Structure 1
Amino acid sequence: SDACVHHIKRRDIVLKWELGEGAFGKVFLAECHNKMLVAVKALKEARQDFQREAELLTMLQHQHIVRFFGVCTEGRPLLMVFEYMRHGDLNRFLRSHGPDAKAGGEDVAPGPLGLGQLLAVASQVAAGMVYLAGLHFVHRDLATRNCLVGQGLVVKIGDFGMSRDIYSTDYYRVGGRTMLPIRWMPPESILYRKFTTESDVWSFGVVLWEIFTYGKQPWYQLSNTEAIDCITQGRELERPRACPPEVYAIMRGCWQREPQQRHSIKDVHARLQALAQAPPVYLDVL
């Protein structure tokens, strides 16, 4: 126990209703009195994996990492208190604001999401990955499904959380047990099965691809085995229609076969941030 986790009395937590069910956890919408709304995670049992995660969740504090408030161990089931993100995960957000579904909102225009919005969303995910790469933390399952959207179009990296139970189609089940998001995985992670920070920047290019594709699954064209091949033979994803050539260069910069030939996430974020606050007339031409 290197760091210490804050604790929240069970009297403070008042469960309203469920937000989703997982194979190992349950997310309820609840209130805390430290009065705001929070998202609590109930363990379905793993107690060692509870404290270990909380210790790691506490150390990770940033503007684009899901805000961890603490735990509650004064009565089973054990709880993990997260902040509430209004628009759910990024993948379900992107899809519901694409040209495919089916009328404005409070945080977003009628849609589809314009270039300025997509660049804004992309920069926030990139900014959060620089922090993780700065701590040399390796997020081995980077995708739009594992990013949350809050009130005000703020994007934070959230889940894992039963993403292998919700989006089971995004994972290849290796052997009898264990799933791999091979469509988001780099060649060295498929072949030699090695994961690094440079293996994450590959995943971000795939994440950056999802954004300008409005939530579609990468290599939706293919099956799991065919997707493995195309990545193995070094076949790249084609530039999505909503993506300008200026941004597709950033994707390919994340898709170099040699992991060290790939650009740093600090450099990728630098390009994405600059394009975000860029004046209208500069983006209209893009």
Structure 2
Amino acid sequence: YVPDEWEVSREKITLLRELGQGSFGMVYEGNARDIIKGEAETRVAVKTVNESASLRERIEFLNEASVMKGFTCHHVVRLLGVVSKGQPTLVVMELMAHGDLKSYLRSLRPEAENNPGRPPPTLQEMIQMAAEIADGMAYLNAKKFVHRDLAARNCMVAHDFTVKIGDFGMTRDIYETDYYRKGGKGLLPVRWMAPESLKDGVFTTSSDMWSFGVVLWEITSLAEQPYQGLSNEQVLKFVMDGGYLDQPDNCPERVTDLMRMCWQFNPNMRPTFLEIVNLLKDDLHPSFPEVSFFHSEENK
């Protein structure tokens, strides 16, 4: 790594509370000073990277950081600053009060010790999450990028409950060819991957679109472990053969439909993130077109 237009003065960052015992480092919430030229102090999210991390995680960290530097979408966790000056390194992101979606969902489970006092997401709320994530994904693809790691565990939930994309360690550039092909050995999110990706190690927007579907399944099932009861080995075979997860109990027919779409075995039958957002535009909170990339002018 090497400094640039971000690298913020460490003396401007204060770590208040811890919000996640990562293994590669951690995630703290804190307050900052003079980040947004116009505001004195602003509360942020701070993701650290252990000094003594993994030869592998490090890279996937900077990738995440870097890749973010070019994004600007209401639905894609905003990057604020970096700090390579002395271990541990920091990536200052906008604070997503309610944590990652997986955890947020897992906390809606009635059996939950850390329950928020409310029921699981309702059809409306889902459609909302669906479109926001979809949008964020749409934007991402537009800036020529394939995520490869879409999952509730990588989506963040803001204070007001807006869902956004927040982890980018596995993201790859596709401006060139519009796809990514895994070379050799590596670690991949098998349970979220599409048949072709499973089969040929090829990642496209459609594969992300497939994952999208899985994320819906995660939501509609409060983050169950996809293909639970199936061995990593068995899951490959099962999905490459044309298998897909089952609708959870009481699953909104309308979200089921969305999943049947995302799980089309033939990648070209799967919708686009935009076609999705479009398919929903009518039933969303009013503050959507103001912020949405879909309704933005940058979409043309």
TM-score by length of structure 1 reads 0.81
Q: What does residue 6 of structure 2 align with?
A: 6
3-state SS of 1:14 partner: strand
Question: Within 2, Cα distance between the matches of 1:54 and 1:243?
Answer: 36
Q: What does residue 42 of structure 1 align with?
A: 48
Question: Within 2, Cα distance between the matches of 1:63 and 1:265?
Answer: 16
Show the 5 A alignment for 1:251-270.
251-270=259-278
Deviation, 1:201, is 0.3
Question: Within 2, Cα distance between the matches of 1:180 and 1:36?
Answer: 36
Q: What does residue 26 of structure 1 align with?
A: 26
Note if contact 1:183-1:219 (Cα within 8 Å) is conserved in structure 2.
Answer: yes
Deviation, 1:198, is 1.1
Q: Which amino acid aligns with 1:37?
A: R
Question: Within 1, Cα distance between the matches of 2:114 and 2:87?
Answer: 43
Deviates further, 222-231 or 52-61: 52-61
* Percent of aligned positions that are identical: 42
Note if contact 1:5-1:58 (Cα within 8 Å) is conserved in structure 2.
Answer: no
Note if contact 1:5-1:55 (Cα within 8 Å) is conserved in structure 2.
Answer: no
The equivalent position to 1:63 in structure 2, one of 74, 83, 94, is 74
Deviates further, 153-162 or 126-135: 153-162
- Superposed CA RMSD: 2.8
Q: Which amino acid aligns with 1:22?
A: G
Deviates further, 81-90 or 66-75: 66-75
Deviation, 1:254, is 1.0
Q: What does residue 77 of structure 1 align with?
A: 88
Question: Within 2, Cα distance between the matches of 1:188 and 1:23?
Answer: 30
Question: Within 2, Cα distance between the matches of 1:21 and 1:97?
Answer: 21
Note if contact 1:66-1:156 (Cα within 8 Å) is conserved in structure 2.
Answer: yes
CA change 1:110–1:51 in 2 (3 A) is closer
Q: What does residue 282 of structure 2 align with?
A: 274
Report whether the alignment pairs 1:89 with 2:100.
yes
CA change 1:117–1:98 in 2 (3 A) is farther
Q: What does residue 217 of structure 2 align with?
A: 209
Deviation, 1:52, is 5.2
Return 5+ residue gaps in structure 2 as ranges.
Answer: 35-40, 171-184, 287-300
Give CA deviations for 1:142-198 in whole Å, capped at 9, x if unaligned: 100000111111111112579xxxxxxxxxxxxxx7422111101111111111111
Q: Which amino acid aligns with 1:92?
A: S
3-state SS of 1:250 partner: helix
Question: Within 1, Cα distance between the matches of 2:28 and 2:103?
Answer: 18
CA change 1:229–1:65 in 2 (3 A) is same
Question: Within 1, Cα distance between the matches of 2:17 and 2:115?
Answer: 26
Show the 5 A alignment for 1:191-230.
191-230=199-238
Q: Which amino acid aligns with 2:120?
A: P
Deviates further, 123-132 or 232-241: 232-241
Question: Within 2, Cα distance between the matches of 1:217 and 1:134?
Answer: 30
TM-score by length of structure 2 reads 0.77
Question: Within 2, Cα distance between the matches of 1:52 and 1:110?
Answer: 36
3-state SS of 2:19 partner: strand
3-state SS of 1:63 partner: coil
Question: Within 2, Cα distance between the matches of 1:89 and 1:184?
Answer: 17
Question: Within 2, Cα distance between the matches of 1:77 and 1:133?
Answer: 32
Q: What does residue 173 of structure 1 align with?
A: none
| Number of corresponding residues | 260
CA change 1:202–1:61 in 2 (3 A) is same
Show the 5 A alignment for 1:126-205.
126-159=134-167, 178-205=186-213
Give CA deviations for 1:107-144 in whole Å, capped at 9, x if unaligned: xx721322111221121111111101112211111100
CA change 1:104–1:48 in 2 (3 A) is closer
Question: Within 2, Cα distance between the matches of 1:102 and 1:262?
Answer: 38
Deviation, 1:104, is 8.9
Q: Which amino acid aligns with 2:16?
A: K
Question: Within 2, Cα distance between the matches of 1:38 and 1:192?
Answer: 40
Q: Which amino acid aligns with 1:32?
A: A
Report whether the alignment pairs 1:121 with 2:132.
no
Deviation, 1:64, is 1.0
